[PDB]
Coordinates of C-alpha atoms in Angstrom, one line a residue:
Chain M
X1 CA -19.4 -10.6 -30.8
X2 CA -16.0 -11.1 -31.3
X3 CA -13.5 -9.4 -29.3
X4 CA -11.1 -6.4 -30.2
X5 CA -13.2 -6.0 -33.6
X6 CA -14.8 -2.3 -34.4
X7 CA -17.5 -1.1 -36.2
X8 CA -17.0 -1.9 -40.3
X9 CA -18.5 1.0 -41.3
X10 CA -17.4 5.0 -41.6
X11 CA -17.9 7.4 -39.1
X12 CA -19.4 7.2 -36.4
X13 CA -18.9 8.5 -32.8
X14 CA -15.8 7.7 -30.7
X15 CA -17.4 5.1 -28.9
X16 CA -17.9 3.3 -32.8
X17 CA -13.9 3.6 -32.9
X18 CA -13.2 2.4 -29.7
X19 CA -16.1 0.4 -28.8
X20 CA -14.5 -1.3 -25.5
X21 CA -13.1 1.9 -24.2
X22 CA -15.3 2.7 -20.4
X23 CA -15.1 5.9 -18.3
X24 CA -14.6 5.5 -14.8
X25 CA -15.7 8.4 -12.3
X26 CA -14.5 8.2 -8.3
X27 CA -16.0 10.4 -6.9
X28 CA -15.6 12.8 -2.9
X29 CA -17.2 16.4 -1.8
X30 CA -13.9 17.5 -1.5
X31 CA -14.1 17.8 -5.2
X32 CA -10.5 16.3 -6.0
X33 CA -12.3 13.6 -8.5
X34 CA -10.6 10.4 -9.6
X35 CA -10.6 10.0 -13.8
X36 CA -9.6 7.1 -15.5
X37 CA -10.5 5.0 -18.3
X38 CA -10.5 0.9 -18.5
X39 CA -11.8 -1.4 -21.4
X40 CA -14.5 -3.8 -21.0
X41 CA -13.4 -7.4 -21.3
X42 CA -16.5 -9.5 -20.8
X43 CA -20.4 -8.5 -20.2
X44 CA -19.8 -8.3 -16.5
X45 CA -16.3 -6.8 -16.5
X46 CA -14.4 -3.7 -17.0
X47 CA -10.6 -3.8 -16.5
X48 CA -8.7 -0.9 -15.7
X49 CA -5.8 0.1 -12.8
X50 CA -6.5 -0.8 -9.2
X51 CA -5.0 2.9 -7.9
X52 CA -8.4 4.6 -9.4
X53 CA -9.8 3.3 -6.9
X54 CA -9.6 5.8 -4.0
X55 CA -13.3 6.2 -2.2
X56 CA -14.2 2.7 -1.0
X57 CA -18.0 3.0 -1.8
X58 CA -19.0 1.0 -5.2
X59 CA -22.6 1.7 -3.9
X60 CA -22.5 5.6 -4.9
X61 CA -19.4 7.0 -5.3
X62 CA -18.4 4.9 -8.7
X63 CA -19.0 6.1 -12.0
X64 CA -18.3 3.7 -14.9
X65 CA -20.3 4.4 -18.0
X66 CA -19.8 2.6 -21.4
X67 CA -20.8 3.5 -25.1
X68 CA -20.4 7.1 -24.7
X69 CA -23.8 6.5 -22.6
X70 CA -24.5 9.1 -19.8
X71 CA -25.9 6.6 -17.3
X72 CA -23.6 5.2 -14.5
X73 CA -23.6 0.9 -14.6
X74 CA -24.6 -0.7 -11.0
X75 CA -21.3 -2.4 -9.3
X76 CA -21.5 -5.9 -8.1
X77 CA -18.0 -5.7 -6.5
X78 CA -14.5 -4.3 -7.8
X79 CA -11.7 -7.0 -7.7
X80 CA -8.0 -6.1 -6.9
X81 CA -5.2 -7.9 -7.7
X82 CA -4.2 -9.7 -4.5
X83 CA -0.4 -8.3 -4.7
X84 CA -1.6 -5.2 -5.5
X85 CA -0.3 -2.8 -2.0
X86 CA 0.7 1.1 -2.9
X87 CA 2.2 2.2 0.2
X88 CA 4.1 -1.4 0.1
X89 CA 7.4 0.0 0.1
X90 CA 6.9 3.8 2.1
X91 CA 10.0 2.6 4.0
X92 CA 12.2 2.4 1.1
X93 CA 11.8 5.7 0.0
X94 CA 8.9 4.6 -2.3
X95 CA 5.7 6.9 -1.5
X96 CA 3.7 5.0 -4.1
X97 CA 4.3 1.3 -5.4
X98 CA 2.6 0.6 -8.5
X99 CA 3.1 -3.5 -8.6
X100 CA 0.1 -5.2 -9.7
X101 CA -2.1 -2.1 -11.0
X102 CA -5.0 -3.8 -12.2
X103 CA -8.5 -4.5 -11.2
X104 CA -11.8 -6.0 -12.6
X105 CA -15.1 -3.6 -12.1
X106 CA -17.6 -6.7 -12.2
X107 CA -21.5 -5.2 -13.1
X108 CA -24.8 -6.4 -12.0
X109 CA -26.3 -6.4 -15.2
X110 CA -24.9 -8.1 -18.0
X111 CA -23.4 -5.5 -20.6
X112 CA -25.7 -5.7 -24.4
X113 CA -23.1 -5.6 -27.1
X114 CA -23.4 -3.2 -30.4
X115 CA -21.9 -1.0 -32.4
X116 CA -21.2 1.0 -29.9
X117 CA -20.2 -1.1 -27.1
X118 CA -17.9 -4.5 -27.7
X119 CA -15.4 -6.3 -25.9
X120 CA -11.6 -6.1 -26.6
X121 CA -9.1 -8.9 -26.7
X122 CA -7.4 -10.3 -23.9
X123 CA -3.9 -12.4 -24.1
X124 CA -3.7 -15.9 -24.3
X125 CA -7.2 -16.1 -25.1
X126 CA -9.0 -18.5 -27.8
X127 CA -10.5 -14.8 -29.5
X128 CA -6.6 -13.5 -29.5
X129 CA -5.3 -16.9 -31.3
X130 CA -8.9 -16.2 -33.8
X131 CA -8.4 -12.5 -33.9
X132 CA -5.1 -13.4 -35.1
X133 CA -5.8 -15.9 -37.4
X134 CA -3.4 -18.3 -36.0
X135 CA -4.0 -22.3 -35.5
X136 CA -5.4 -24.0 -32.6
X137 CA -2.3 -25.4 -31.6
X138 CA -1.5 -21.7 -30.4
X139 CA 0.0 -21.3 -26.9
X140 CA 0.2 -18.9 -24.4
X141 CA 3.9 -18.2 -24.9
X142 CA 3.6 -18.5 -29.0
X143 CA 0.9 -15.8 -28.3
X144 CA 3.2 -13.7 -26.2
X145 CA 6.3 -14.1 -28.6
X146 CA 3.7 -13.1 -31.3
X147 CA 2.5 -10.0 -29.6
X148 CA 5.3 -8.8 -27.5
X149 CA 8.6 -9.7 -29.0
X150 CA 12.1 -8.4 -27.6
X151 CA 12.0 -5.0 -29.8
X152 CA 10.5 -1.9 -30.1
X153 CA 6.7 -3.1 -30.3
X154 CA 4.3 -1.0 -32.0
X155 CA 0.9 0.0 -29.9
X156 CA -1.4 2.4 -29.1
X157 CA -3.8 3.7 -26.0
X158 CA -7.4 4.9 -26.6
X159 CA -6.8 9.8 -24.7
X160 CA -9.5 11.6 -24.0
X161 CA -8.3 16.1 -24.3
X162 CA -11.4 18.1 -25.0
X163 CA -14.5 15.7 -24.9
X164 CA -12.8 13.9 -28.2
X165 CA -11.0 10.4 -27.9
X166 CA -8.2 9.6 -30.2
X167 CA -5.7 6.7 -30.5
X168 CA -2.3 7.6 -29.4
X169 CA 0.6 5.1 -31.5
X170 CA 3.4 4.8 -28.8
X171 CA 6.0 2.4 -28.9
X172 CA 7.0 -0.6 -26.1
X173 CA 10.8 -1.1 -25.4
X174 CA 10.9 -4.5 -25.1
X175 CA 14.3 -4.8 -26.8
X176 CA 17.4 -3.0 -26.4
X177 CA 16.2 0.1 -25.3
X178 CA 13.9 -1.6 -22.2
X179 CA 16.6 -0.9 -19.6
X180 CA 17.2 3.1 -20.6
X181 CA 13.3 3.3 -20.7
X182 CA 13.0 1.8 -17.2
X183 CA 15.6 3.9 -15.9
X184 CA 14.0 7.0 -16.7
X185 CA 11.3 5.7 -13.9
X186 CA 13.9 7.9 -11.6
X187 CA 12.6 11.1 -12.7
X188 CA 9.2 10.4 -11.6
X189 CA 7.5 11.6 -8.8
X190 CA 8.5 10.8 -5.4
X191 CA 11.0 8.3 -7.2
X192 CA 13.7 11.3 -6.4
X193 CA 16.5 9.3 -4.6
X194 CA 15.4 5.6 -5.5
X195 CA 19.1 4.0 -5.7
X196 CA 17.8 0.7 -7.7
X197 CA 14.7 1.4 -10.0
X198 CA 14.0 -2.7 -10.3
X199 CA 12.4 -1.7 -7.0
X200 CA 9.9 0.8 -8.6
X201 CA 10.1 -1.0 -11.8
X202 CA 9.1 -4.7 -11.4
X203 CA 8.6 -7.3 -14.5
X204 CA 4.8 -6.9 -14.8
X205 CA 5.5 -3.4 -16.3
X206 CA 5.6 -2.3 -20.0
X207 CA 7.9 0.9 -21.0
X208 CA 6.3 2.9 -23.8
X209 CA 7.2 7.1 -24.0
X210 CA 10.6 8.7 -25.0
X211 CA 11.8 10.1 -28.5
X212 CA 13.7 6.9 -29.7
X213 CA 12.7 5.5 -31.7
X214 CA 10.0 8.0 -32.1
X215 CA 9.1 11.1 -30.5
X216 CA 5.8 9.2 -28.7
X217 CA 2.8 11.1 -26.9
X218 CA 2.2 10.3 -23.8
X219 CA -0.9 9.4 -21.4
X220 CA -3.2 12.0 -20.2
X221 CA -4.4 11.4 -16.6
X222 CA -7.7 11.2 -17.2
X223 CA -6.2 8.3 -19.4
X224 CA -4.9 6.3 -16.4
X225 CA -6.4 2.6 -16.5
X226 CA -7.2 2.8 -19.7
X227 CA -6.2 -0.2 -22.1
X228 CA -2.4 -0.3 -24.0
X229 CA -3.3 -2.1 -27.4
X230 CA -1.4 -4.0 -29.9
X231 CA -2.9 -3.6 -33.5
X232 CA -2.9 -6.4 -35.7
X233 CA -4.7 -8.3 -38.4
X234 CA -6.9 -5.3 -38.4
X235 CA -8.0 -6.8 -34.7
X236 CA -7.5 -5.0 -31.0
X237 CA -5.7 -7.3 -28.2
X238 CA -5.0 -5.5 -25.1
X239 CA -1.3 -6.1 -24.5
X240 CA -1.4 -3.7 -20.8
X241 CA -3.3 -1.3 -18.2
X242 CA -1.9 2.1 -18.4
X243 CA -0.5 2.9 -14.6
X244 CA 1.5 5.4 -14.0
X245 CA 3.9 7.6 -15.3
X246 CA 7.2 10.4 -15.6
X247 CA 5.0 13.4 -16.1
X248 CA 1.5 14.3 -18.0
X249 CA 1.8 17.2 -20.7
X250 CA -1.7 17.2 -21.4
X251 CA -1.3 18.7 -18.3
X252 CA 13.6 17.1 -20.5
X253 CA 10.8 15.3 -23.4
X254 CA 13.5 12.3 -23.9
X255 CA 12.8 11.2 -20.2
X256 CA 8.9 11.1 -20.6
X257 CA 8.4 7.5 -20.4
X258 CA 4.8 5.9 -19.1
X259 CA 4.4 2.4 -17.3
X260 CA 1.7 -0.2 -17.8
X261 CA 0.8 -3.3 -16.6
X262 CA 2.0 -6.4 -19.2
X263 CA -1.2 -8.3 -18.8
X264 CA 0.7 -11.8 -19.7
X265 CA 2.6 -11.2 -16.1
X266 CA -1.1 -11.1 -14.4
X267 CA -2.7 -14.0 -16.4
X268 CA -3.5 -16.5 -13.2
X269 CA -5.6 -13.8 -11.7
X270 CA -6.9 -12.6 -14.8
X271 CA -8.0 -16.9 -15.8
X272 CA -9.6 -17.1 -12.3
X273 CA -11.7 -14.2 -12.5
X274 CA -12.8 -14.2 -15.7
X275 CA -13.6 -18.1 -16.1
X276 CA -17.1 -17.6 -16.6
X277 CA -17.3 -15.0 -19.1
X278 CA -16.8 -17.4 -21.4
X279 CA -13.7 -16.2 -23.1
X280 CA -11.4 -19.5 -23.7
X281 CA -8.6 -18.8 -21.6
X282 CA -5.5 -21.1 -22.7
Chain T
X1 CA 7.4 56.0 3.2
X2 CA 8.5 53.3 1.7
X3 CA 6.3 50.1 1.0
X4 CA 8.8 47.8 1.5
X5 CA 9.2 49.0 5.4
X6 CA 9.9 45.6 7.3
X7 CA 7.3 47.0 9.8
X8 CA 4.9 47.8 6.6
X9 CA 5.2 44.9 5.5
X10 CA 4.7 42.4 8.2
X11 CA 0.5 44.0 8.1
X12 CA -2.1 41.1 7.3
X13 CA -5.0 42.1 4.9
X14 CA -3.4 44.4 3.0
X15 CA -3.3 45.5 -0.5
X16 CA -2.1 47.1 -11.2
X17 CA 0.6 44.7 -11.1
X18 CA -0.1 40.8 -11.4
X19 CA -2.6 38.6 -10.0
X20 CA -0.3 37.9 -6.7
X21 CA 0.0 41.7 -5.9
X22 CA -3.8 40.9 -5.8
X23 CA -3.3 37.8 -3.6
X24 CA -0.1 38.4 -1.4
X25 CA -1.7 35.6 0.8
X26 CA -2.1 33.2 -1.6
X27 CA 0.0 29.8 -1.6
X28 CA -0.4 27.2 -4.4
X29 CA -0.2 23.3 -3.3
X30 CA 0.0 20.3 -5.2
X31 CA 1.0 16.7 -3.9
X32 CA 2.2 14.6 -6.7
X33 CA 2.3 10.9 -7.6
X34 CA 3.6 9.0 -10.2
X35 CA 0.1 7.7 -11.2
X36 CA -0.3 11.4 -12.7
X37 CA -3.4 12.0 -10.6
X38 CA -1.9 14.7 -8.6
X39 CA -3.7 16.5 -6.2
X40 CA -4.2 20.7 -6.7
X41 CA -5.1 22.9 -3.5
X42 CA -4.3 26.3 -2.4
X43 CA -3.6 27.8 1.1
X44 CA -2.8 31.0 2.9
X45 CA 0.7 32.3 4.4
X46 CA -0.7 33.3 7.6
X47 CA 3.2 33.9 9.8
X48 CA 6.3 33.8 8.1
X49 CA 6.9 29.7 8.7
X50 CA 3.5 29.1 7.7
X51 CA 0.4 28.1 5.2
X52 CA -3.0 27.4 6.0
X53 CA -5.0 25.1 4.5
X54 CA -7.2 21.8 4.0
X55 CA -5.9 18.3 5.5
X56 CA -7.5 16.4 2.8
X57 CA -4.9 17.9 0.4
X58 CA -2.5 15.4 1.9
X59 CA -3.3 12.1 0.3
X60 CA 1.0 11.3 -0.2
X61 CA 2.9 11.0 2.8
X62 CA 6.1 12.2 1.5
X63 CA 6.9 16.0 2.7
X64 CA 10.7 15.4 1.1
X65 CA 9.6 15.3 -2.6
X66 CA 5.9 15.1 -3.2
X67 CA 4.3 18.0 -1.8
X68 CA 5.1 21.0 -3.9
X69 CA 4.0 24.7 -2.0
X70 CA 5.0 27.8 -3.8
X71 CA 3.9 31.4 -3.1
X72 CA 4.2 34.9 -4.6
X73 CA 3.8 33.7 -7.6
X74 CA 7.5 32.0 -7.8
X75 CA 8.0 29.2 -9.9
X76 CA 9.9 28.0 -7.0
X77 CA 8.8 25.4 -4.6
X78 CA 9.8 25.9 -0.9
X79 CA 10.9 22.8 1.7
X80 CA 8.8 21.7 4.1
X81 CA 9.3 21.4 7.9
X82 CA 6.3 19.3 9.1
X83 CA 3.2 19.1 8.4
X84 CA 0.4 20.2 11.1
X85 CA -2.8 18.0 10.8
X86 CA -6.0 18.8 13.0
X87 CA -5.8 16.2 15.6
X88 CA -9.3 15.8 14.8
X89 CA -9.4 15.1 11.6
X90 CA -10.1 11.8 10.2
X91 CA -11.4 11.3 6.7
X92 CA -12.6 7.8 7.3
X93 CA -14.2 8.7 10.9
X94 CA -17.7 7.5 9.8
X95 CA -17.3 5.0 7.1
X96 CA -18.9 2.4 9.1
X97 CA -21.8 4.9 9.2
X98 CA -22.4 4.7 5.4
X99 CA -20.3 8.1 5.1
X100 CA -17.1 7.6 2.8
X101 CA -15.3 11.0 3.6
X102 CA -15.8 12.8 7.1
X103 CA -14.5 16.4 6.5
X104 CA -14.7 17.5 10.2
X105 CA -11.7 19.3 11.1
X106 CA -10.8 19.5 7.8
X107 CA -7.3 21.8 8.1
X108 CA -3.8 21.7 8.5
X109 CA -0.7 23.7 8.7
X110 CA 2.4 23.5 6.8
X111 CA 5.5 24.6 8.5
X112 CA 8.0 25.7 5.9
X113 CA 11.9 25.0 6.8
X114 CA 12.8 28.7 5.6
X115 CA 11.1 31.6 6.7
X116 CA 9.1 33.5 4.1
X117 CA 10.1 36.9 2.8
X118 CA 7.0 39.2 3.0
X119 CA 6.7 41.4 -0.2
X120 CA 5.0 43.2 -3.0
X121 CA 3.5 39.3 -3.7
X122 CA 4.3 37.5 -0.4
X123 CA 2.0 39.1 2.9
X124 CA -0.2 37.0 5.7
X125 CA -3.5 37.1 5.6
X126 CA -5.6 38.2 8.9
X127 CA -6.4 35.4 11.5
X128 CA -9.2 35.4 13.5
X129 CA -9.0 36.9 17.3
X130 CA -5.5 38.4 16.8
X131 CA -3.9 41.4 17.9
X132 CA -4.0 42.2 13.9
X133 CA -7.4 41.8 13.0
X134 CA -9.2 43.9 16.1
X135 CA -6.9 47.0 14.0
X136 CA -7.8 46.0 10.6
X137 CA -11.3 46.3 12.0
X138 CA -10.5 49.6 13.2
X139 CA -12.0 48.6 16.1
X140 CA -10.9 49.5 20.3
X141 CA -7.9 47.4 21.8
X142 CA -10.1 46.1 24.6
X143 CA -11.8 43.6 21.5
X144 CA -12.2 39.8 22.6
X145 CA -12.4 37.0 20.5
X146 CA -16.1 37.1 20.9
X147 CA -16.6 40.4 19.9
X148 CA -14.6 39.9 17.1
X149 CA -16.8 37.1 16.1
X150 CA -19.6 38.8 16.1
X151 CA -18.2 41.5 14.1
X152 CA -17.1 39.0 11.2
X153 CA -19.6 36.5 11.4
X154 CA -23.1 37.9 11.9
X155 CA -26.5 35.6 11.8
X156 CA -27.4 37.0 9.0
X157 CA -25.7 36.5 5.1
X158 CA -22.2 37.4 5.3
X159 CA -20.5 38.7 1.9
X160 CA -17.6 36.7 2.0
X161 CA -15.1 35.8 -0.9
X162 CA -12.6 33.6 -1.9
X163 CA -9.4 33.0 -4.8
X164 CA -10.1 30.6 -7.9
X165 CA -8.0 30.2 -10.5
X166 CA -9.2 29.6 -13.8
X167 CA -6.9 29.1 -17.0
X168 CA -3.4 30.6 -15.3
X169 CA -5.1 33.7 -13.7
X170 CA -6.5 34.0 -10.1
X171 CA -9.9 35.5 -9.6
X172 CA -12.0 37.0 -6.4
X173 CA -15.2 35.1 -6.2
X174 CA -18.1 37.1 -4.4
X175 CA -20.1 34.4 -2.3
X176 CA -22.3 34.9 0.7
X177 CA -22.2 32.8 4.0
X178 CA -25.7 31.7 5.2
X179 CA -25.0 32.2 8.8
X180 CA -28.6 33.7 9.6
X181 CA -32.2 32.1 8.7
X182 CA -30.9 30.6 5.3
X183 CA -28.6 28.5 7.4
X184 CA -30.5 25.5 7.7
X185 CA -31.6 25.5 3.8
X186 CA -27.8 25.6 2.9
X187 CA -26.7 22.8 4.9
X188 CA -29.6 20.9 4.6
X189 CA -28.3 20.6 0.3
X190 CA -24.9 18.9 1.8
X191 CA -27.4 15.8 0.9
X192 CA -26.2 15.9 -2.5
X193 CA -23.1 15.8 -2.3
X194 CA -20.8 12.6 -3.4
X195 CA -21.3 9.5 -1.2
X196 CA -24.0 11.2 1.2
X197 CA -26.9 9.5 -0.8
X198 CA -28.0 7.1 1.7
X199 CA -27.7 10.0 5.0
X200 CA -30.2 10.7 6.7
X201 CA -28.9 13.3 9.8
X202 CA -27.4 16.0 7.8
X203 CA -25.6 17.0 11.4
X204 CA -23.7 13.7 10.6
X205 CA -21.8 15.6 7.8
X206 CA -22.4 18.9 8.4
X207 CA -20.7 19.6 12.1
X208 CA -20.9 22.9 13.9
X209 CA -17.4 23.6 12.2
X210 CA -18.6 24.5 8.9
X211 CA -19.6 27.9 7.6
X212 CA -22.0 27.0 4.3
X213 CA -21.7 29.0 1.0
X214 CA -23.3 28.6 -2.6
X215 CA -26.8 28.6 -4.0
X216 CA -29.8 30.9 -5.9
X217 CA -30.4 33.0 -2.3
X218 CA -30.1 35.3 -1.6
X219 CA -28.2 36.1 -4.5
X220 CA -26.4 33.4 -7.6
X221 CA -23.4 32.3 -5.5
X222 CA -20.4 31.0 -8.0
X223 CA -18.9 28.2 -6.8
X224 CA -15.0 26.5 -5.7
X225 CA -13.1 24.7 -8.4
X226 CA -11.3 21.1 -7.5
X227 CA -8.6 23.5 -7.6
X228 CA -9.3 25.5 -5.1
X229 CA -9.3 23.5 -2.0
X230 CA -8.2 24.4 0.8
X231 CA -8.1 28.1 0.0
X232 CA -8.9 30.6 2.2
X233 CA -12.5 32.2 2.8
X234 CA -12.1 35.6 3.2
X235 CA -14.1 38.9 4.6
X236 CA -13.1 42.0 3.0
X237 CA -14.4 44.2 6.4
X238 CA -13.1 47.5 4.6
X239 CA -10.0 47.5 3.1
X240 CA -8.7 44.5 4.9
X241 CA -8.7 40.8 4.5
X242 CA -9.5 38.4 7.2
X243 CA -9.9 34.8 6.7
X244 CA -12.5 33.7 8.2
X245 CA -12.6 30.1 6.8
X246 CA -10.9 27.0 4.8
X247 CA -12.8 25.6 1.5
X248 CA -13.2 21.9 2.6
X249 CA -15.9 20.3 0.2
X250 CA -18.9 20.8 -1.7
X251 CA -21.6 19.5 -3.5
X252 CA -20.6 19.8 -7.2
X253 CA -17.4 21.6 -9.4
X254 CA -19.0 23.1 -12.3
X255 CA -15.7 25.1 -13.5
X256 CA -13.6 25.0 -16.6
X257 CA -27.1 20.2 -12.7
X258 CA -29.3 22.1 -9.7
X259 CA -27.5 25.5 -9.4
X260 CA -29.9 25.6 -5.8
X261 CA -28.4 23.2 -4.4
X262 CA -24.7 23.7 -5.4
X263 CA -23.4 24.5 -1.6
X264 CA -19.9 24.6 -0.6
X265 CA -18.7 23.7 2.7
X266 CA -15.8 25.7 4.6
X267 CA -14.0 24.6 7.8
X268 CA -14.9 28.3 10.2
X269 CA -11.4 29.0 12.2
X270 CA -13.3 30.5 14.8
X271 CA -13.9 26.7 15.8
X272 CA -10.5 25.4 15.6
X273 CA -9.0 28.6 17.5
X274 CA -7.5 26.5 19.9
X275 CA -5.4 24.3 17.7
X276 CA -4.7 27.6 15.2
X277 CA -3.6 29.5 18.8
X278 CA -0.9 26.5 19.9
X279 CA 0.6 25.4 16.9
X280 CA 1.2 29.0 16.0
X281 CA 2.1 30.3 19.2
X282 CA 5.7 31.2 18.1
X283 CA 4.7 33.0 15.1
X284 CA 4.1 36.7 16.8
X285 CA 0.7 36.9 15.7
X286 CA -0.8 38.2 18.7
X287 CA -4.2 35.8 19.7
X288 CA -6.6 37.3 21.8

């Protein structure tokens, strides 16, 4: 199949839409469930955000379904990044350090492609440079100039409100609104009386949220993990990993700005763990 | 007289108006992270410096501007002193055992920095073995803790109840503790719950300090929304509320399967009097 491309036909259930989009389940008695979402990448892989990850047991306590199917997929192993560490900077006056918010669910069984469940895109990737019809003597930082370019950068992130998915068109500040989007991290939780922000906002993050240049909705958390994707050539590439937020209104507007992972800042982790899956990694 | 008598006032149990004239007792909790997967319990003002409720609630270590307790229905969230947690409790205790999330011991206390205002929406609920409950029981002053115990908590099914809240509005849920012969059935469900696929020994989840709601029998017990947690278990013994238990965990959240074997797990005070008696020595509350 080739990555990031939907269903050519009208119709069709959410999962025909978003074909890539997985459901991930963490579950405890206490009841106090982890929800988030991630986006398979490969037959054996799902990416989504290494925080989801909160009851070490991959044995029974995981649920990650695809498809829209009901069943839960058996877990070989989940993969963190190595640099990921959330309580890395308690001392500081950070209660949760979102650095490096990614992780690979790898499956036991090898995932059957259809209309209902295809990979998406990943950046500098030989399906990216075909999926945007550009030549082969396409680099990784033509791709990245290409898909995230220092302005306001169109994309869009796959909510889930009332057992209905929809594509949510945000915009990135990559230009010269980044550093009032980053700044707004201050109003996030536990972020209170955080004197610097670089701290809590590092460069393997994506701004998106805000009312300038457009009023743009914002993740749900049950969307957490889920996949930040850059439309183009009528073909999905996912740009980022939703990770964490200023507030949820799914549940002051101009402060309501959401974080993500910039996969292009994670690619030598990504290029190792992925090597096999056949995916032509530049 | 006057309801709003200081003396009056400073009654546990007791109670138109809202849903927190209802539920003087009742404290909302939520511990908040930027990840937006904050975490939603309740508790229950039990002294004027503090609330009652589950330690699992506390999964961010950051009293100063994470944790968010408000009662009485204010919009208004009040600091926080310390936080108490059963010393005791450890989540991960038996994860080399094949059991992700131990539950024994499963409570804490949240001291407030400002003392609480009892009111027409702000009253302590009833501890067990207090000078305060043997009354509400309208039972002799020579009453022990013992006796007491066996006045609340029979071996039989105790009609017990607890707060939910479901779209804005709280809500008195009618459940029944299987403390007599339906004891062992109830527990014996806690095999279903997340994680405890693989367990064997039911004892190795279900400790002596649980009291075990939910289920068909005898009658179609509702069950605790994630919501919920750490909210209080109550006995209405006549006109009076005494709180006999903290909701911990359970084996499925159907708010918002195998209705026989939806059982919910709550953390009986009557075996943690001793840490409930000490940390709370200061508060007036008169332990047997």
């Amino acid at each position: 199949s080739l990555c990031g491309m939907v269903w050519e036909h009208r119709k069709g259930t959410d999962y025909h839409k978003q074909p890539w989009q997985a459901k991930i389940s963490v579950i405890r008695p206490s009841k106090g469930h982890e929800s988030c979402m991630g986006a398979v990448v490969s037959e054996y892989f799902v990416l989504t955000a290494a925080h989801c990850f909160t009851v070490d047991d991959k044995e029974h306590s995981i649920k990650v379904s695809v498809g829209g199917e009901k069943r839960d997929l058996e877990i070989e192993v989940v993969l963190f990044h190595p640099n990921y560490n959330i309580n890395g900077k308690k001392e500081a006056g950070i209660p949760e350090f979102y650095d490096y918010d990614v992780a690979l669910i790898k499956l036991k069984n090898k995932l059957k492609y259809g209309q209902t469940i295809r990979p998406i895109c990943l950046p500098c990737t030989e399906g990216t440079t075909r999926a945007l019809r550009l030549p082969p003597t396409t680099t990784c930082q033509q791709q990245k100039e290409e898909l995230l370019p220092a302005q306001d950068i169109k994309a869009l992130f796959v909510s889930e409100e009332e057992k209905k998915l929809t594509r949510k068109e945000v915009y990135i500040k990559n230009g010269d609104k980044k550093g009032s989007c980053e700044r707004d991290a201050q109003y996030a939780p536990g972020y209170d009386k955080v004197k610097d922000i670089s701290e809590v906002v590092t460069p393997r993050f994506l701004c998106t949220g805000g009312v300038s240049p457009y009023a743009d909705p914002n993740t749900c958390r049950g969307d957490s993990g889920g996949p930040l994707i850059v439309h183009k050539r009528s073909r999905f590439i996912q740009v980022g990993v939703i990770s964490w937020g200023v507030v949820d209104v799914c549940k002051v507007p101009a402060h309501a700005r959401d974080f993500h992972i910039n996969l292009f800042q994670v690619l030598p982790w990504l290029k190792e763990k992925l090597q096999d899956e056949d995916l032509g990694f530049l």
